[PDB]
Ligand binder design. Structure first.
Ligand SMILES: CCCCCCCCCCCCCCCC(=O)OC[C@H](COP(=O)(O)OC[C@@H](O)CO)OC(=O)CCCCCCCCCCCCCCC
Ligand SMILES: CCCCCCCCCCCCCCCC(=O)OC[C@H](COP(=O)(O)OC[C@@H](O)CO)OC(=O)CCCCCCCCCCCCCCC
Ligand SMILES: CCCCCCCCCCCCCCCC(=O)OC[C@H](COP(=O)(O)OC[C@@H](O)CO)OC(=O)CCCCCCCCCCCCCCC
Ligand SMILES: CCCCCCCCCCCCCCCC(=O)OC[C@H](COP(=O)(O)OC[C@@H](O)CO)OC(=O)CCCCCCCCCCCCCCC
Ligand SMILES: CCCCCCCCCCCCCCCC(=O)OC[C@H](COP(=O)(O)OC[C@@H](O)CO)OC(=O)CCCCCCCCCCCCCCC
Ligand SMILES: CCCCCCCCCCCCCCCC(=O)OC[C@H](COP(=O)(O)OC[C@@H](O)CO)OC(=O)CCCCCCCCCCCCCCC
Ligand SMILES: CCCCCCCCCCCCCCCC(=O)OC[C@H](COP(=O)(O)OC[C@@H](O)CO)OC(=O)CCCCCCCCCCCCCCC
Ligand SMILES: CCCCCCCCCCCCCCCC(=O)OC[C@H](COP(=O)(O)OC[C@@H](O)CO)OC(=O)CCCCCCCCCCCCCCC
Ligand SMILES: CCCCCCCCCCCCCCCC(=O)OC[C@H](COP(=O)(O)OC[C@@H](O)CO)OC(=O)CCCCCCCCCCCCCCC
Ligand SMILES: CCCCCCCCCCCCCCCC(=O)OC[C@H](COP(=O)(O)OC[C@@H](O)CO)OC(=O)CCCCCCCCCCCCCCC
Ligand SMILES: CCCCCCCCCCCCCCCC(=O)OC[C@H](COP(=O)(O)OC[C@@H](O)CO)OC(=O)CCCCCCCCCCCCCCC
Ligand SMILES: CCCCCCCCCCCCCCCC(=O)OC[C@H](COP(=O)(O)OC[C@@H](O)CO)OC(=O)CCCCCCCCCCCCCCC
Ligand SMILES: CCCCCCCCCCCCCCCC(=O)OC[C@H](COP(=O)(O)OC[C@@H](O)CO)OC(=O)CCCCCCCCCCCCCCC
Lengths: 69, 69, 69, 69, 69, 69, 69, 69, 69, 69, 69, 69, 69, 69, 69, 69, 69, 69, 69
């Protein structure tokens, strides 16, 4: 019931599937970035940027719950 | 009665349902943005923009009541 | 009497009902706009536009009385 | 007498009643336009158009007397 | 009896058949959109648009029951 | 029977044929994009875009089943 | 038969012809890039970019088969 | 006999004649499009559009037999 | 006879005449493009675009025969 | 006769006249570029660009005959 | 006659007038450059750049005749 | 005799007179277009359009004889 | 006589009058463009555009006679 | 008489008035540009641009007479 | 009279008022620049730039009268 | 006499009266257009359009005498 | 008398009244533009546009008398 | 009386009310700009832009009276 | 009354609430900037920029009252 309960369930399923997919994408990104940095194509702060992005992505639900009260 | 009370109640129900749905959408957006920033596709101000948008969306009713007096 | 007093009363009732409905619509619009801005779909001037629109709509009667003298 | 004095009086009464009705319609129009502009459905020049229309309608008798001499 | 019970049954049958047909059309649309995005003919927000449209279409009956009360 | 089962079968046949055709189009697009990138006409994000598009197109039926429930 | 078998054959012929043409285009691009680099008009990463692009274009069918399953 | 067999034969003859005529028109269109693109009057997607149109027109009978079952 | 054989012959004559005219137009286009590029009004990719367009227009009949089977 | 022989002759006359005009335009362009480069407004690659453009424009007919076979 | 003889004459007049004007502009540029170099605002290669530019601009017609044959 | 020989002669006379008139109109149009282009009111492709139109209008009889056989 | 000789004479008079008027319009346009360029409102290619337009407008009759043969 | 002599006289009057007005506009532009350059808001080539624009606008009549012959 | 004498007078008034205002702006700019230079935020050439800009702005009318003759 | 002398005199009187009225309407139109342009509601070419229209209307009799001979 | 003197007087009265009204509208427009520019919503050329529009509207009668002679 | 006196009074009231409202909007804009500049989101010229806009807005009536004479 | 008094009160409330919110945002910005500067990600002038921005934002009302008189 409630009209949009079904859409909420679908969105929850989509969020779970995207969360499952994300670590593979992050690992592939890091694999490419490490070799790019080894080849003098990018700089060392790229690893810090990647770490910040991955840490933020990991706790996306917690941050959203903290902000969207 | 009052003619348009039923429409107002329907709009209230719609607002409640959209408010219930919104946190999932915000979490999915943040999850995507984290990986996008990790992969050097966007910039660091994206997180600030997301935080501002989510904070405004969380207090939409209060802001509307403050402005539409 | 006066021929069109009844129509004026009906219009006043309609105006009151629409004024009652409007804050919910404004809150829903702001809720959608916040998430749209979080996801990089719109820009920050949208909030300024929304604020101006809501402020104008809130004092519609006063502005009408000021201009239509 | 004068044949059309009665019709002129009826027209004057109708004009007065319509003038009484108009401000409510203008207020309702502005209330709708403000929310429409808040939701990105119209542009900012709509308010200028509304102001010009209301100002012209307010002084309809004076403009008619100035032109129809 | 009830005059329009037969017409309502026909409409329900048509709705069920259209609901059955829709997923194939959605899959074809997504298949075309993926290749169009791969070929640099459209943008990444097309997937978000498609997801929103499909989610709305899937819960059409629930949304109609929530609004048309 | 069921009125629209024939149209559903036709749509399924069309979907299967389009799925058969798609890999050739994707291969041609990738072949052109590789030479375009070698010639300094596009950037490296084109390959990521192509990969995302092809992956989404490949699992169109699964995504449609996940969302259109 | 099967509706789109003829179109699939035409697309396969087009793909084979484009694959035949591509090596000449890649060779001309490399010939121009080498002289441009000799004249201090481009940088040394251009050769890496060209190699990556040509390698990806060469195995376009294999990559498409790996991703579009 | 069958009443409309003669009309069907006339339609088949017209279809064969138009099918014979079309390749010349396609060649002329491509000849004009190549020069127009060389002179910076159109874009490179025009060739993709032309190829899709020609492939669809060539296998029109097969597609019609696949859809009109 | 064949009904439309005369129209086909007329189209062939028109195609031959346009093919005869085209090289002059291509030469004029390239003559203008060279001077425009000399004066810093356009970029160096214009020559690649022109070459692609002229090569495609030259073999328009062959491409049409390859695609329109 | 031949239908478009007159148009071809007109195009050849136009091409010859433009070829006659071009050297003056190239000389004026080089005269302006030299002074602009003397005043530190442009860089030394401008002369290479101008030389390439003028050389290409000089043999436009030969290049067109080479590519449009 | 010849169609573009008049335009060619106008272009020649413009070229002669610009050639007459140029030495004054070159002298002013050199006068400014000398003082700028005296005050440590530019480097000594500026004079070499100016000399190359002025020498190239002086023989613009001869270089154009050498290249545009 | 021949019934319509007189009408054909009248049409030929009208065609000759219109052909005599046209060059003046074309010259006036080009005179206006040049000034409009100088004043930044139109674009450079207007000259190409004008040239194509004038060339087609010049050999209208030849094209009509080539097509209407 | 000749039916349309009078219209041709009128058109010639109109063309002569427009040719007389044009130099004033060109001078005014250049006067405005120079100040606009001095005020950073347009770019330096505006002068090239103006010169091309004025030169074309000057020899409009000659170009018309060359193309419309 | 001469049909358009009156319009030509009006255009000459407008040109004279605009020529009278222009020096004030140029002076105001230079006054603003000097302070803008002092405040590090623009660059030093702005004065060269202004000088070129003013010199061109000053001799607009002479340039128009030289080109429009 | 003379049509645009009023506009010229208004422009002269605006020029005089801006000339009156400018010294205050120049003084404020120099006051900020001195402290910015003392704090190691800018370099010593800023004062030369400021002096050149102020000197040019002070004699804007004289330079305009010298160039716009 | 002459049947239509009276009608011609009436038309001449009407033309004189309309010519007397026109300047006021043109001034009002320009006054409105100036404010509309100041308010960013229209573009700068509106002034050119107005000037062309007013100049044409001013010499309407002369143009009519030139064309209608 | 003169038939249309009354309409001319009415138009003169309307012109005077609109001229009286205009300065208030111009002041309001400038007040809004200043705040919009301070809020980074528009650019600095808006003030130049406003000044030009107001100056043109101020001398509308003079410009009309200069052009409509 | 005078027809448009009432509209002028209404416009004066609107101008006074907007002038009263403006300082709050300017203060809010400055408050947001200061924090945005502190967070490295905008540059230091924004304060100069804001000051220019506010100074222009404050003396809107005086500038309108100076230009619209 | 006075029409826009209500809007002014709403704007004052919004300004007070934004002023209340601002110190937290400034503190968070400084907290992030300190760590960024510690990790060699930004320079030491960032603190000066932050101090200037915060000081300007703190006295926004006073500065607005000083400039907007
Ligand atoms: C003086 C030396 C200074 C620089 C040091 C290096 C100089 C010479 C280096 C020789 C390298 C030659 C080739 C290796 C390239 C290299 O060293 O760059 C490392 C490569 C990506 O690096 P980059 O992003 O820097 O590529 C070049 C760009 O920088 C050009 O802007 O990472 C890999 O995974 C290697 C892939 C090999 C290429 C084949 C790929 C085919 C399969 C993948 C396609 C699937 C589609 C989806 C993918 C997400
Ligand atoms: C040879 C050494 C040269 C460099 C020295 C340092 C190298 C190694 C540094 C190790 C750092 C590892 C991780 C610490 C990061 C660090 O040191 O960088 C400081 C960080 C911002 O740093 P950056 O802007 O430099 O990030 C990278 C950019 O430079 C990319 O260009 O400031 C913080 O607030 C730290 C937050 C921790 C990350 C987790 C955040 C999750 C919750 C917050 C999300 C809420 C959303 C809204 C927020 C407003
Ligand atoms: C690389 C990253 C760059 C971009 C960042 C985001 C990338 C990935 C984002 C994933 C989002 C997936 C889904 C969330 C969508 C999202 O993120 O966009 C926010 C959404 C609408 O915003 P948009 O303007 O972006 O909508 C799509 C447009 O982009 C179309 O062009 O607001 C919502 O309330 C979410 C609702 C979810 C959809 C279900 C709704 C069904 C019930 C409502 C119908 C009732 C009828 C009356 C309504 C008034
Ligand atoms: C020198 C290195 C410089 C660049 C660093 C990275 C280089 C190599 C990266 C390899 C990545 C390969 C693939 C991962 C892509 C990646 O790393 O980019 C992160 C991706 C979004 O990336 P972008 O917005 O940059 O996409 C490409 C655009 O930039 C094109 O302009 O976020 C994800 O969620 C990844 C999903 C994987 C793809 C499968 C999705 C299928 C199911 C979802 C569909 C449901 C519909 C609704 C959705 C809301
Ligand atoms: C420098 C690179 C910049 C661009 C990157 C790509 C360059 C080269 C691309 C090569 C593509 C060659 C051909 C593949 C085309 C391609 O890659 O574009 C993808 C195609 C449509 O894409 P577009 O939106 O670009 O179509 C043309 C538009 O651009 C027109 O403006 O989607 C498909 O399903 C492909 C079908 C192949 C054509 C045969 C279809 C016939 C049977 C179907 C008919 C049934 C009727 C009902 C249908 C629902
Ligand atoms: C100084 C160096 C800086 C830049 C590096 C390169 C400079 C010199 C490059 C020389 C290249 C010369 C020619 C090769 C072109 C090249 O290198 O660009 C790669 C080409 C597409 O390139 P672009 O999209 O950049 O084309 C020009 C556009 O950029 C215009 O803006 O991809 C191909 O498949 C090549 C095909 C050859 C052309 C013949 C095709 C005819 C048959 C196909 C038609 C069928 C219709 C349907 C199609 C789907
Ligand atoms: C501190 C030193 C650092 C920089 C060194 C130079 C600084 C001072 C230079 C003083 C120069 C002052 C004036 C000379 C200008 C100069 O030195 O720049 C050289 C000039 C064009 O140069 P630019 O393209 O650099 O012009 C400025 C541009 O850079 C603005 O973006 O070439 C000429 O032909 C000179 C014409 C003089 C202007 C009169 C022309 C009037 C008749 C022609 C119009 C016909 C229309 C159609 C034309 C195709
Ligand atoms: C202090 C030194 C610093 C710089 C070092 C070099 C300075 C002096 C160099 C002298 C070079 C003079 C001439 C050689 C040119 C040179 O060095 O540049 C190399 C040239 C392209 O170079 P760029 O891209 O740098 O061209 C100029 C651009 O940089 C403008 O931004 O590559 C070639 O293939 C050469 C062709 C010769 C030109 C004739 C071509 C005509 C027929 C081909 C056209 C067919 C159309 C289709 C094509 C795909
Ligand atoms: C710091 C320097 C930066 C810029 C470098 C150059 C600055 C100075 C250049 C001086 C050039 C002055 C005049 C030469 C113009 C020039 O150099 O630009 C090259 C010209 C066209 O160039 P554009 O497309 O750039 O024209 C202006 C456009 O850019 C406007 O957007 O090509 C020609 O054929 C020249 C013809 C001369 C004009 C007479 C033509 C009359 C007969 C033809 C009409 C027949 C109708 C049918 C036509 C198909
Ligand atoms: C971010 C900023 C971007 C936009 C800048 C401006 C924003 C704020 C502007 C405030 C304007 C408030 C009101 C002034 C309006 C304004 O500024 O627009 C200028 C006005 C007409 O302008 P528009 O064509 O833009 O009218 C509105 C159009 O947008 C309709 O779509 O011209 C006037 O004459 C003003 C008259 C005032 C209204 C009273 C007239 C009553 C008597 C006349 C009736 C006689 C009948 C016959 C007439 C021929
Ligand atoms: C910080 C510096 C950066 C930018 C540099 C400039 C900043 C300051 C400039 C001060 C300008 C103030 C006023 C001078 C204006 C100025 O400098 O712009 C130059 C003006 C036209 O310039 P624009 O096309 O740029 O006009 C503004 C447009 O850019 C708006 O988008 O040329 C003139 O002829 C001057 C006329 C003065 C206005 C009065 C005209 C009234 C009678 C004529 C009407 C007859 C109708 C028919 C006409 C054909
Ligand atoms: C390594 C460091 C490099 C960057 C330095 C800063 C990094 C970390 C900064 C942390 C900031 C976190 C959040 C504070 C945001 C911040 O610091 O940015 C300052 C904020 C807007 O600034 P921006 O233009 O940067 O906004 C985001 C844009 O950058 C997106 O492109 O100004 C404010 O007024 C703050 C309001 C707080 C947000 C809550 C508002 C909710 C109620 C008000 C809504 C009423 C509607 C009508 C309004 C007119
Ligand atoms: C190891 C040392 C190396 C660096 C030396 C200095 C280090 C420490 C310096 C401490 C300075 C702390 C504060 C003084 C600032 C300072 O020293 O910088 C000097 C300041 C401008 O400096 P900057 O342009 O460098 O500002 C920061 C920028 O560099 C950010 O990129 O000039 C002033 O007028 C100072 C005003 C004080 C701030 C209050 C202003 C509020 C009212 C005015 C607003 C009205 C709006 C319109 C205005 C036109």
């Amino acid at each position: 019931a409630q009209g949009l309960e079904k859409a909420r369930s679908v969105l929850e399923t989509l969020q779970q599937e995207l969360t499952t997919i994300v670590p593979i994408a992050a690992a592939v990104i890091l694999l490419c970035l490490g070799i790019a940095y080894a080849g003098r194509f990018i700089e060392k702060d790229t690893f810090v940027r990647w770490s910040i992005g991955v840490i933020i992505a990991g706790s996306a639900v917690q941050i959203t719950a903290m902000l969207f009260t």
